[PDB]
Design an enzyme around this catalytic site. Structure first.
Site, mmCIF file in Angstrom:
data_model
loop_
_atom_site.group_PDB
_atom_site.id
_atom_site.type_symbol
_atom_site.label_atom_id
_atom_site.label_comp_id
_atom_site.label_asym_id
_atom_site.label_seq_id
_atom_site.Cartn_x
_atom_site.Cartn_y
_atom_site.Cartn_z
ATOM 1 N N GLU A 16 -7.228 -6.204 -5.815
ATOM 2 C CA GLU A 16 -7.290 -5.507 -4.531
ATOM 3 C C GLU A 16 -7.591 -6.466 -3.382
ATOM 4 O O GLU A 16 -8.481 -7.313 -3.486
ATOM 5 C CB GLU A 16 -8.351 -4.397 -4.585
ATOM 6 C CG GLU A 16 -8.491 -3.555 -3.309
ATOM 7 C CD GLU A 16 -9.655 -2.565 -3.363
ATOM 8 O OE1 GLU A 16 -10.389 -2.540 -4.378
ATOM 9 O OE2 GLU A 16 -9.844 -1.813 -2.382
ATOM 10 N N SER B 135 -7.116 -0.818 2.411
ATOM 11 C CA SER B 135 -6.970 -1.200 1.018
ATOM 12 C C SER B 135 -5.504 -1.492 0.694
ATOM 13 O O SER B 135 -4.615 -0.688 0.988
ATOM 14 C CB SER B 135 -7.521 -0.109 0.101
ATOM 15 O OG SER B 135 -7.418 -0.492 -1.261
ATOM 16 N N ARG C 234 0.823 -1.203 0.000
ATOM 17 C CA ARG C 234 0.000 0.000 0.000
ATOM 18 C C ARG C 234 0.859 1.257 0.000
ATOM 19 O O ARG C 234 1.758 1.412 0.834
ATOM 20 C CB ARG C 234 -0.949 0.012 1.201
#
Length: 185
Positions: A142, A111, A81
């Site tokens: 994702e 996320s 990330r």
């Protein structure tokens, strides 16, 4: 089921609204209320602060149980990330993220990506333990994490120390001031 569709609404657009609410960052209080009524969490305008949050939590719950219903992918070991830590308002987080051994709690849905990381001032090589809550989304690449996942800061590498280059190229990218290796607890 309703659980699954709750995950999709969040995934498609509801995230910025919900995450901001969960991280207690500023947000459009109207939109959230409109959303709750839109998705039948509330049947009428909230008469109190208690009603709003109760509903909002019930909504979170549906996304969570929706994210839980997915199949785990234990083949994955690292996810990534990008992070904009250097912004002045976030110096509170930055200080925690840099401290080795510091625990960081992400109150919203984290996320990530198993494929790469969007280039920023901070890149997170995230270690993954057996039986974690994180799920690959695909149809809903994702990987998303349920509310309040725990992070431990293992290693912080600034651009000054030579360790920078050798670790960077184990992170697929697409200005990078700090690389941070972190484990999910």
């Amino acid at each position: 089921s309703k659980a699954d569709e709750a995950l999709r609404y969040y995934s498609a657009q509801g995230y910025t609204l919900l995450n901001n609410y969960l991280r207690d960052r500023p947000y459009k209080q109207r939109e959230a209320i409109d959303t709750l009524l839109s998705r039948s969490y509330l049947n009428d305008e909230p008469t109190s602060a208690g009603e709003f949050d109760k509903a909002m939590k019930a909504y979170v719950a549906d996304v969570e149980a929706g994210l839980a219903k997915l199949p785990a992918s234990p083949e994955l070991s690292f996810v990534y990330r990008g992070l904009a830590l250097d912004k002045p308002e976030l110096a509170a987080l930055k200080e925690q993220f840099t401290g080795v051994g510091n625990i960081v709690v992400e109150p919203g849905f984290m996320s990530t990506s198993p494929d790469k990381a969007w280039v920023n001032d901070t890149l997170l090589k995230i270690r993954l333990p057996a039986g974690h809550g994180g799920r690959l989304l695909g149809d809903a690449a994702e990987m998303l994490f349920p509310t309040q996942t725990r992070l431990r800061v293992d290693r912080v590498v600034s651009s000054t120390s030579g360790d920078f280059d050798t670790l960077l190229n184990t992170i697929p990218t697409s200005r990078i001031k700090r690389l941070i290796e972190v484990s999910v607890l």
